[PDB]
Design a protein around this ligand. Structure first.
Ligand SMILES: N#Cc1ccccc1O
Ligand SMILES: N#Cc1ccccc1O
Length: 175
């Protein structure tokens, strides 16, 4: 690794990670599963009704958006969603001990996983959670790759799985 290469991990954090996996969109769009989304991975509603999604948006931002937000607003909502994922892990009796056992980079993969799936979906992964706690990284990754989360939308999940396997940021290099 070059000097520049050794600096790369200091440039990566949970915000940069999710920003690559989710992208940044200032207008309402349908995600890989057809759910209304905006900003950096913010799921507005699972409803097929666009007007339901616009309603959720105005509630989330606090102004009349008509389907459109600013970069600053996207960032504020993203920061809210990241904190919600972190709080969701820490208060959960099943996820917290697993999270605490993980190194810093895998803790980012855990927050990303919860951001994407929610707490009950992750805490339901009984085998993966045991694998991670036991540092069985290859097995954990093979088992995450069986999930609907990954298989319905592989491009959004693949880097998180690799990060669980390796504990490095290598999947986020060379976009
Ligand atoms: N509670 C708590 C906590 C805070 C930062 C990182 C890991 C934790 O379990
Ligand atoms: N898989 C997994 C996992 C374990 C602990 C906390 C968050 C997670 O996504």
């Amino acid at each position: 690794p070059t000097t520049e290469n050794l600096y790369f991990q200091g440039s990566m954090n949970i915000f940069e990670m999710l920003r690559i996996d989710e992208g940044l969109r200032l207008k309402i769009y349908k995600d890989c599963e057809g759910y209304y989304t905006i900003g950096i991975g913010h799921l507005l509603t699972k409803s097929p009704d666009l007007n339901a999604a616009k309603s959720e948006l105005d509630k989330a931002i606090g102004r009349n958006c008509n389907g459109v937000i600013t970069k600053d607003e996207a960032e504020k909502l993203f920061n809210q969603d990241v904190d919600a994922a972190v709080r969701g892990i820490l208060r959960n009796a099943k996820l917290k001990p697993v999270y605490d056992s993980l190194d810093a980079v895998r803790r980012c993969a855990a927050i990303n996983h919860v951001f994407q799936m929610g707490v009950t979906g992750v805490a339901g992964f009984t085998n993966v959670l045991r694998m991670l706690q036991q540092k069985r990284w290859d097995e954990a990754a093979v088992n995450l790759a069986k999930s609907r989360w990954y298989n319905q939308c592989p491009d959004r999940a693949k880097r998180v799985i690799t990060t669980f396997r390796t504990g490095t940021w290598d999947a986020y290099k060379n976009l």
